[PDB]
Amino acid sequence: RTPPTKVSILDIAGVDDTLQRLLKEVWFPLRGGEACEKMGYRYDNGVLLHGPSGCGKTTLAHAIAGSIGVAFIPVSAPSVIGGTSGESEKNIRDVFDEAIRLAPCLIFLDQIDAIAGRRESANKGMESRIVAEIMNGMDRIRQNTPLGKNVVVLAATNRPEFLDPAIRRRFSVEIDMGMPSERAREQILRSLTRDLSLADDINFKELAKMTPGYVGSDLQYVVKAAVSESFQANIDSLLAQARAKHPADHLANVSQPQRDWLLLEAHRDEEVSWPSTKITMEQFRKAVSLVQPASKREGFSTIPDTTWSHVGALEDVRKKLEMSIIGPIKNPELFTRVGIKPAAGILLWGPPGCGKTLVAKAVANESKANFISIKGPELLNKYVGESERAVRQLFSRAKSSAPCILFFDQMDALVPRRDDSLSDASARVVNTLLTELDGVGDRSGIYVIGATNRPDMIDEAIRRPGRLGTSIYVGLPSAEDRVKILKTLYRNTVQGTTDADLEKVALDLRCTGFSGADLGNLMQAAAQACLERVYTQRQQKRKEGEEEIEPVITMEDWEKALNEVKPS
Amino acid sequence: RTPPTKVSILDIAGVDDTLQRLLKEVWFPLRGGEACEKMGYRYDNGVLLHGPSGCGKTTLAHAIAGSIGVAFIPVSAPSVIGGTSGESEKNIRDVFDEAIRLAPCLIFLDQIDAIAGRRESANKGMESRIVAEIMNGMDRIRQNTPLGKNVVVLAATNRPEFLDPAIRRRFSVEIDMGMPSERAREQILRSLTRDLSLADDINFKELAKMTPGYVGSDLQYVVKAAVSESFQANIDSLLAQARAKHPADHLANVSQPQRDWLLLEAHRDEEVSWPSTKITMEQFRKAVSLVQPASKREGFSTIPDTTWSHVGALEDVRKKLEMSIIGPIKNPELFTRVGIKPAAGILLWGPPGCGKTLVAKAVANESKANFISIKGPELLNKYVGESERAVRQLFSRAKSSAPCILFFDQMDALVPRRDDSLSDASARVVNTLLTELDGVGDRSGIYVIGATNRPDMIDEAIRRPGRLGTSIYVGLPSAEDRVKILKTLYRNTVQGTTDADLEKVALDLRCTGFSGADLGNLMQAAAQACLERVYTQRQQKRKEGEEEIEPVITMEDWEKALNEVKPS
Ligand SMILES: Nc1ncnc2c1ncn2[C@@H]1O[C@H](COP(=O)(O)OP(=O)(O)OP(=O)(O)O)[C@@H](O)[C@H]1O
Ligand SMILES: Nc1ncnc2c1ncn2[C@@H]1O[C@H](COP(=O)(O)OP(=O)(O)OP(=O)(O)O)[C@@H](O)[C@H]1O
Ligand SMILES: Nc1ncnc2c1ncn2[C@@H]1O[C@H](COP(=O)(O)OP(=O)(O)OP(=O)(O)O)[C@@H](O)[C@H]1O
């Protein structure tokens, strides 16, 4: 005999539409058994749950069993496999036999791709035989049903493509338990927090927004982490209290952790009352920093510390960018009301990497959105079929994690091979690209930014609205801007600040023919030269004559570094 | 019923940070049970302890149990396995059932890779079933918990790669019990010596200091080795005594070991009184020399006697190296104040056998930091999913014992498999490597040095600053160095040594454009020419005229060999 378990039904949320459908399909046959028998009409047999790992498939099934109050028979992937070639099949029979005999019940097949994979991919005579056993069992249920047998077979899988097309046909109902979005994460957070006394400064909405690739289990842990962090105050109190009851002078201490441990060991039968404290928003942020995501090894690319303050001038461009990208992301309400469709893509042309990197990253950071950077010819192969498949993969990855900015650096290679007939490989890639661009735009969230140092030879087809229609021209040469950049870089140091020196450096001819990346390099070069001076002087004095170290940087260091460094 | 044991908590030391973390996670749920029940918040369930064998994992667990005063349930690797196919599973259930019933308790799973290894590596139907039983038990605990059930599951393993990824996910907290310290070894030595009568000249502190990568088991053996060494005096005494009782003249001897054996055999029923002697410091040093752990594949690697005085010239390279490695280790204050992130790695490229290994050791030695050397194909295994986990392990070990220099010799194997699509295994490994490199930059202490005799096909991604960005070019063209090499090779011969000849040979133009391998070949070539002279002369004289053979080598042989041989 196998009775049901006690799991919390108030734990799962964000699955409103799907749970409703499940309820409709499962409630009538299980709960009103007498009614279905009298009518003579047939019902739903198999319910397949799919989606990514940790999506709450196992929990949903467990919850449903507990809530209805029916008998739960858990069939895990390797639980039926035995030692001898026959015991496995015998067990499958017994499972189905006992199940049909006792009703109402819920049979749950957790991780089904391990038992019933494609019969062409399995060259073993045991695996094919097991699939056959399942099929036979399914038929037996169908025949017995009009008497008073009420059993529903639930199943969970992570990938539908790995399953045998034959079993797919047998199963009738399918529920998609998809990716936890911003809204979904918010809901999950609320479910977990339900039993906790939250403070007024805590905004679960803010937490959800700044939580990219976290799953239901991860969020569960973030909540637990916050709990431990809050109870550090009580630990400090106990330490002070212990050192007063049992002093032990300085004999109990060799280090800090060991002394704390020893005091607690001495106490033993001492019971203490713990005050119920509230958690802060700061504690949650601390907890979030210490937690790890799931999709971290893929094409994620983290957003740098680049803001608008790092970009000198280009105020007109800044405003235009805000309108296009920040407008639809932050204000969807505004766009729906007026009547226009959100953006798809923009194109940047002019100076190089320095200008492009500062633009691409600044906009991306500000929106607090994801960023992916694919640079020029670092995609092409000698073979005929991986290049196109790779491009498809990039867009799929981008689609999965929205909001995201997809950045294409140096497009002068791929695009001009259309106007004149030359290569076949280049033709295929560009055509796939055009195709991918047109496809996305209705659902949005994915904004494509293209950049090139050369605007002349480009195909007009790519330029067309809906693809990369917004052509933004970028230019960097101006003195006032350079001074601002120098100040911004030298702002992040921590006495001697020296403003006059910064202005003079900017005035020089060599500085005029520079870029953002060049100025950064100049700063680093000056720092290195200064270190050389400090090292040579200090070592000479210490050995011949221990003194203090001086991290101060003067003009002589800047001048020498300036003389050597060249642009691009 | 199973009550706690009485083990000394003052025995384990050197684990300050780790013990503190363990305290935080284990103290609150076990000690203040009433408080956690009232609040309704959830806590930590599983704590996994990893690291090498004899690191004190079993002792730490035992100590923690005794110190807190909770019930200790020891579950060893083969303690739950029975005779029939069902008794094993029944026992696992009973363990979890009794454990949840009685609280507060600590369940300790010692050596878990024997019970729950990878389910793909286990083709048995019993092993997979046992893993399933553990999973089911884990879930049962989680459900029961809000009532008043307080049980923490501790576990110890020697290798994280062998564990099933499924159980890894179930366990939440992980503690790394890495490299044993100087203080810790001192303590272990004292524990073992406890029953022995040590002399006054023995300083256990000195032993511990000069014992780098030895574990608890190794130290145990060093003590045993000392015992055998002392009892050699008694052996000599018995030998002399035996040769007096039963002389047997010279009939009992053909060799030395055999005669000794024969005498003892004759005696049989002769009982002798053994005097209790004290061990010396000299005997311990002798014992230490004969002991060897080797640790891992390469394991621990002590720093050689290589300084800057062993390297001829390359003064520019020396200064650059000092800046990068010695700069951040010795002067962290300087780097934080200026504003730049510490080094992560450098690359050494040039001609075959120029002394790349020697330069690497010199830098490491000078910083008085640790050194690990992993050479080319001495990394690859037969397994697939273990390669990536092994790389992760290396970085974890390096992180634990910082400051350390991680040296990769002959990188020509791993790096070129990016520019052209080879396979999937190579792709995963290199991507994991890039990931590991990016992570280490702010935390630092671990500086990665790469060396290769071939620079052509390498991915630019690895070359980027922050990874192996600093490309240092090395060569070998100095006269003084060549003389030293010639002397070193001609040192291993055994009359006529001749120093003047060696210097002149080095001076020649043909010698200037050479390498270490070339000089070795020249020496061999000269030896061959000399043999020809000896053979022709000896045969002519013996036949026409048996005389003696002359192994002497003059300058004429060297000159002829020198004329013919060409470089590479
Ligand atoms: N949608 C969700 N809402 C609340 N909690 C969740 C959700 N999804 C997962 N969790 C938490 O994560 C845990 C894992 O859930 P579960 O094992 O059901 O996921 P899964 O999709 O079945 O994973 P797998 O299929 O790989 O076993 C649950 O115990 C739950 O605490
Ligand atoms: N860190 C340490 N401090 C003091 N003594 C130690 C330490 N580590 C080991 N020892 C000594 O060595 C013995 C072995 O310890 P223990 O069995 O806990 O190591 P282990 O890591 O659990 O080994 P394994 O996991 O292979 O069983 C202990 O009884 C102790 O006397
Ligand atoms: N197997 C060895 N490992 C390290 N040092 C060696 C070895 N054999 C000789 N040496 C030392 O190095 C000098 C010889 O240099 P060699 O031509 O072997 O180049 P190397 O870089 O030291 O060795 P390798 O090229 O094998 O790394 C000698 O002075 C000798 O003392």
Side-chain angles (χ1 to χ4, degrees), chain A residues 2-568, chain B residues 2-568:
Chain A
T2 321
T5 51
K6 293 179 180 180
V7 191
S8 54
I9 315 91
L10 303 81
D11 201 79
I12 311 91
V15 285
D16 299 287
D17 296 271
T18 52
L19 201 54
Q20 268 188 298
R21 280 207 62 202
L22 185 63
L23 172 64
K24 192 202 295 178
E25 271 75 82
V26 186
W27 209 83
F28 173 59
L30 293 190
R31 303 286 300 154
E34 297 179 89
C36 69
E37 285 172 79
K38 287 176 182 179
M39 286 164 212
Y41 315 155
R42 290 298 113 237
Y43 48 80
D44 300 282
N45 293 270
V47 184
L48 184 69
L49 310 176
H50 58 279
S53 181
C55 283
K57 289 182 259 64
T58 309
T59 57
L60 201 77
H62 274 251
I64 269 61
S67 63
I68 302 166
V70 288
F72 199 55
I73 316 296
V75 188
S76 187
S79 292
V80 287
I81 314 299
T84 52
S85 297
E87 204 181 337
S88 303
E89 299 143 56
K90 193 182 181 298
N91 289 335
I92 300 163
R93 271 175 52 243
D94 286 301
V95 169
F96 281 76
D97 281 302
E98 254 195 286
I100 65 168
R101 199 190 67 213
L102 305 169
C105 304
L106 261 173
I107 306 168
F108 182 49
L109 267 292
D110 200 36
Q111 292 168 91
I112 198 165
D113 61 275
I115 305 171
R118 298 180 65 94
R119 279 183 291 187
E120 57 171 52
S121 65
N123 293 284
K124 192 70 183 66
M126 262 287 270
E127 296 183 47
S128 54
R129 223 191 302 155
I130 293 165
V131 183
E133 241 305 294
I134 302 299
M135 232 66 95
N136 183 59
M138 291 295 278
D139 290 295
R140 285 184 295 161
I141 300 170
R142 202 174 300 272
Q143 295 182 96
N144 287 74
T145 309
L147 297 165
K149 316 292 178 291
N150 296 283
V151 285
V152 184
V153 186
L154 257 170
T157 183
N158 303 36
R159 37 179 138 120
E161 308 172 77
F162 220 78
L163 308 181
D164 189 33
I167 60 162
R168 278 269 301 191
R169 288 181 66 110
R170 273 286 182 269
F171 273 69
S172 55
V173 201
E174 284 174 40
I175 278 91
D176 193 1
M177 282 192 85
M179 306 74 87
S181 59
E182 305 181 282
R183 316 290 88 221
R185 289 191 297 268
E186 182 187 80
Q187 293 166 261
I188 299 168
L189 286 165
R190 286 186 288 211
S191 308
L192 308 152
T193 57
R194 192 176 53 90
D195 295 272
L196 292 67
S197 301
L198 304 179
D200 299 274
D201 67 330
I202 304 172
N203 195 30
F204 42 83
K205 194 179 181 181
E206 278 184 81
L207 273 316
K209 284 175 181 177
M210 296 305 277
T211 299
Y214 293 63
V215 210
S217 205
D218 297 331
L219 295 164
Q220 171 201 28
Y221 295 147
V222 181
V223 175
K224 293 179 185 177
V227 173
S228 57
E229 294 302 297
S230 65
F231 294 125
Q232 285 182 267
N234 294 267
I235 263 70
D236 290 298
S237 300
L238 281 156
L239 259 58
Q241 194 184 92
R243 269 138 58 189
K245 291 180 177 179
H246 285 269
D249 293 271
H250 287 285
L251 298 167
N253 50 76
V254 185
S255 58
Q256 306 83 72
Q258 296 184 303
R259 75 175 183 232
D260 299 326
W261 272 101
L262 264 58
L263 292 163
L264 310 165
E265 294 174 46
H267 286 44
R268 291 292 177 87
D269 293 82
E270 293 290 289
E271 281 75 69
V272 60
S273 56
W274 284 51
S276 297
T277 52
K278 287 188 174 183
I279 35 278
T280 52
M281 183 57 190
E282 296 180 90
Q283 282 173 10
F284 266 79
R285 290 175 180 162
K286 198 176 183 180
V288 174
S289 71
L290 298 169
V291 190
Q292 66 287 109
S295 185
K296 51 184 179 297
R297 290 191 64 171
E298 295 180 82
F300 187 68
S301 298
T302 181
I303 47 281
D305 54 278
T306 49
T307 57
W308 301 119
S309 60
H310 288 258
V311 189
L314 293 169
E315 302 294 321
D316 298 312
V317 182
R318 288 182 48 192
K319 292 190 294 178
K320 292 175 71 181
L321 284 162
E322 284 177 84
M323 275 286 121
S324 46
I325 303 97
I326 287 81
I329 297 171
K330 297 228 295 182
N331 293 272
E333 299 178 271
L334 187 69
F335 286 69
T336 52
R337 283 184 297 190
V338 298
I340 54 162
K341 287 187 177 182
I346 68 144
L347 182 73
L348 308 164
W349 50 292
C354 45
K356 293 159 186 305
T357 298
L358 281 167
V359 179
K361 295 168 174 183
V363 188
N365 190 252
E366 193 64 57
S367 54
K368 296 170 178 183
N370 286 308
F371 183 77
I372 308 170
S373 183
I374 291 100
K375 308 153 185 179
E378 297 183 89
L379 266 178
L380 292 73
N381 292 279
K382 294 179 181 180
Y383 308 92
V384 292
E386 280 201 32
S387 190
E388 54 99 353
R389 189 109 74 150
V391 179
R392 191 69 178 95
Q393 268 288 98
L394 293 174
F395 282 81
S396 299
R397 290 167 186 141
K399 266 286 289 173
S400 187
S401 295
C404 181
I405 285 85
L406 190 61
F407 186 50
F408 287 106
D409 196 75
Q410 291 181 85
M411 295 304 271
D412 46 70
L414 311 168
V415 189
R417 302 298 175 203
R418 294 218 70 209
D419 51 86
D420 51 339
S421 301
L422 197 68
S423 186
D424 195 35
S426 62
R428 288 193 302 273
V429 181
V430 71
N431 285 319
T432 328
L433 197 69
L434 287 164
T435 260
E436 288 303 296
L437 285 167
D438 290 302
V440 63
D442 294 270
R443 57 273 184 137
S444 295
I446 310 92
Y447 304 104
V448 182
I449 302 183
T452 182
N453 308 17
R454 299 188 58 149
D456 42 82
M457 278 294 122
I458 276 167
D459 188 21
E460 294 179 79
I462 286 83
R463 287 188 284 213
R464 196 199 68 92
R467 297 183 177 129
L468 292 176
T470 321
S471 298
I472 297 177
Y473 177 54
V474 191
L476 277 171
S478 45
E480 299 178 270
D481 297 30
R482 298 201 300 278
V483 185
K484 295 173 184 179
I485 301 165
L486 288 167
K487 285 189 175 183
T488 308
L489 293 168
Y490 200 65
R491 193 179 57 102
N492 306 274
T493 44
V494 287
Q495 294 180 84
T497 178
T498 59
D499 295 271
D501 291 57
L502 302 159
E503 280 83 54
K504 292 178 182 179
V505 174
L507 290 172
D508 292 279
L509 305 167
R510 25 270 180 98
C511 288
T512 316
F514 269 3
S515 67
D518 295 331
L519 297 175
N521 197 256
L522 214 184
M523 190 270 261
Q524 284 198 332
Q528 289 180 254
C530 185
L531 299 185
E532 290 183 85
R533 187 185 59 89
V534 181
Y535 255 74
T536 53
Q537 201 177 266
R538 195 192 66 217
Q539 285 176 281
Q540 192 186 94
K541 290 191 292 178
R542 279 187 177 193
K543 292 173 184 178
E544 291 188 289
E546 295 181 89
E547 291 182 271
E548 296 179 276
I549 310 93
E550 295 178 275
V552 64
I553 176 173
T554 53
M555 216 172 137
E556 299 179 271
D557 305 295
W558 257 301
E559 289 177 43
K560 286 178 178 294
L562 187 67
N563 285 123
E564 299 179 273
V565 72
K566 293 294 178 181
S568 292
Chain B
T2 321
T5 51
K6 292 179 180 180
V7 189
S8 54
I9 316 92
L10 302 81
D11 200 79
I12 312 91
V15 284
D16 297 294
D17 297 89
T18 52
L19 204 52
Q20 234 175 338
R21 281 207 63 203
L22 185 63
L23 179 59
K24 194 201 293 177
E25 272 75 83
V26 186
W27 209 83
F28 172 56
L30 293 190
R31 304 285 300 152
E34 297 179 89
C36 69
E37 285 172 80
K38 287 176 182 179
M39 287 151 203
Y41 315 161
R42 290 298 113 236
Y43 48 81
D44 300 282
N45 293 269
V47 185
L48 184 69
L49 310 176
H50 58 281
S53 181
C55 280
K57 289 181 259 64
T58 309
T59 58
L60 203 77
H62 275 249
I64 268 59
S67 70
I68 301 166
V70 288
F72 199 55
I73 317 295
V75 188
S76 186
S79 292
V80 288
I81 314 298
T84 51
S85 298
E87 204 181 337
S88 303
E89 298 142 57
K90 193 183 181 297
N91 288 335
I92 299 163
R93 271 174 52 242
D94 286 301
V95 170
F96 281 77
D97 281 302
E98 253 196 286
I100 65 169
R101 199 189 67 211
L102 304 168
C105 303
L106 262 173
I107 306 167
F108 183 49
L109 266 293
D110 200 37
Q111 293 168 90
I112 198 166
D113 61 275
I115 305 171
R118 298 180 65 95
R119 279 183 291 188
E120 57 171 52
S121 66
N123 293 284
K124 191 69 184 69
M126 259 286 267
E127 296 183 47
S128 53
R129 223 190 304 153
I130 293 165
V131 184
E133 245 299 299
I134 302 300
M135 236 65 100
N136 185 57
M138 291 296 279
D139 290 296
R140 285 185 295 163
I141 300 172
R142 201 174 300 273
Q143 297 181 96
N144 286 74
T145 307
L147 297 165
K149 318 292 178 290
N150 295 283
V151 286
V152 183
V153 186
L154 257 170
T157 184
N158 302 35
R159 37 179 138 121
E161 325 184 52
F162 221 78
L163 308 182
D164 189 33
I167 61 162
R168 279 269 300 190
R169 289 180 64 107
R170 273 285 182 269
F171 273 70
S172 53
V173 200
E174 284 174 41
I175 278 90
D176 193 1
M177 283 193 85
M179 305 74 240
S181 64
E182 307 179 281
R183 316 290 87 222
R185 290 190 296 268
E186 184 188 79
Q187 291 164 253
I188 301 170
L189 286 165
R190 287 185 288 209
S191 308
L192 308 151
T193 57
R194 191 176 53 91
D195 295 272
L196 291 69
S197 301
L198 304 179
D200 299 274
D201 67 330
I202 304 173
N203 195 32
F204 42 83
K205 194 180 182 180
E206 277 184 82
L207 273 314
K209 284 175 181 177
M210 298 305 277
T211 300
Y214 292 61
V215 216
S217 200
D218 299 329
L219 295 165
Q220 171 199 27
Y221 295 148
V222 181
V223 176
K224 293 179 182 177
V227 179
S228 56
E229 293 302 298
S230 64
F231 293 127
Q232 285 182 265
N234 294 267
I235 264 69
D236 291 298
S237 300
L238 282 156
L239 261 58
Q241 194 183 91
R243 270 136 58 188
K245 291 181 177 179
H246 286 270
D249 293 272
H250 287 286
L251 298 167
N253 50 77
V254 186
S255 60
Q256 305 84 71
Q258 296 183 305
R259 74 175 185 231
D260 298 325
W261 273 103
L262 264 60
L263 293 163
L264 310 167
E265 298 176 39
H267 287 45
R268 293 292 176 88
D269 294 81
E270 293 291 289
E271 281 75 69
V272 60
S273 56
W274 283 50
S276 296
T277 52
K278 286 188 174 183
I279 36 277
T280 51
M281 183 57 189
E282 295 180 270
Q283 283 171 9
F284 266 79
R285 290 175 180 162
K286 199 175 181 182
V288 175
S289 71
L290 298 169
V291 186
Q292 197 63 243
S295 296
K296 314 293 183 298
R297 211 166 184 162
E298 300 291 291
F300 71 107
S301 303
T302 178
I303 48 280
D305 54 278
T306 50
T307 57
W308 301 119
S309 61
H310 288 256
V311 189
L314 296 168
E315 302 294 321
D316 298 311
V317 182
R318 287 183 49 192
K319 293 189 295 176
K320 291 174 71 182
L321 284 163
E322 283 178 85
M323 278 279 118
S324 48
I325 303 96
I326 288 80
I329 298 172
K330 298 227 295 183
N331 293 270
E333 299 178 271
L334 184 66
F335 286 69
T336 52
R337 286 181 300 183
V338 298
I340 54 165
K341 286 188 181 185
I346 68 142
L347 184 73
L348 303 168
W349 62 280
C354 61
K356 300 178 184 299
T357 326
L358 297 173
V359 182
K361 289 167 171 182
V363 185
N365 191 242
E366 197 64 60
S367 57
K368 296 172 183 180
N370 286 308
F371 183 77
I372 307 169
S373 183
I374 290 102
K375 307 153 186 178
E378 295 178 63
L379 216 165
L380 290 72
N381 275 282
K382 52 178 182 179
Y383 267 101
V384 283
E386 280 198 29
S387 189
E388 54 99 352
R389 201 120 66 144
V391 179
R392 191 68 179 96
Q393 267 288 97
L394 290 175
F395 282 81
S396 299
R397 291 165 187 144
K399 266 287 290 175
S400 189
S401 291
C404 181
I405 284 84
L406 190 61
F407 186 50
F408 286 106
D409 196 75
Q410 293 179 81
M411 288 301 266
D412 46 71
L414 311 167
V415 200
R417 303 303 181 196
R418 294 218 72 204
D419 50 87
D420 47 347
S421 298
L422 171 87
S423 84
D424 198 35
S426 63
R428 288 192 301 273
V429 182
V430 74
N431 285 318
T432 319
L433 199 70
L434 288 164
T435 267
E436 289 303 295
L437 284 167
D438 285 305
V440 59
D442 290 85
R443 50 193 195 181
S444 296
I446 312 90
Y447 304 99
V448 182
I449 302 183
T452 183
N453 307 22
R454 300 188 58 154
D456 45 83
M457 280 291 122
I458 275 168
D459 189 21
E460 293 181 77
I462 286 87
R463 287 188 285 212
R464 285 183 191 144
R467 297 183 177 129
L468 286 182
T470 322
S471 300
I472 297 177
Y473 176 57
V474 194
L476 190 73
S478 48
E480 298 178 271
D481 294 40
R482 298 201 301 278
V483 185
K484 294 173 185 178
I485 301 165
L486 288 167
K487 285 189 176 183
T488 307
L489 293 167
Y490 200 65
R491 193 179 57 103
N492 305 275
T493 44
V494 287
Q495 294 180 84
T497 178
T498 59
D499 295 271
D501 292 57
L502 302 159
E503 280 83 54
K504 292 178 181 180
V505 174
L507 290 172
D508 292 279
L509 305 168
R510 25 270 180 98
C511 288
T512 316
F514 268 4
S515 64
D518 295 331
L519 296 175
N521 197 256
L522 214 184
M523 192 268 265
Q524 283 198 332
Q528 288 178 252
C530 186
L531 300 188
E532 290 183 84
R533 187 186 59 89
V534 180
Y535 254 76
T536 53
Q537 201 178 267
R538 194 192 65 216
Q539 286 175 281
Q540 192 187 94
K541 291 190 292 178
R542 279 187 176 193
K543 292 173 184 178
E544 291 187 289
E546 295 181 89
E547 291 182 271
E548 296 179 275
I549 310 91
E550 294 179 275
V552 66
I553 176 173
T554 52
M555 216 173 137
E556 299 178 271
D557 305 295
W558 257 302
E559 289 177 43
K560 287 178 178 294
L562 187 67
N563 285 124
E564 299 178 274
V565 72
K566 293 294 177 182
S568 298

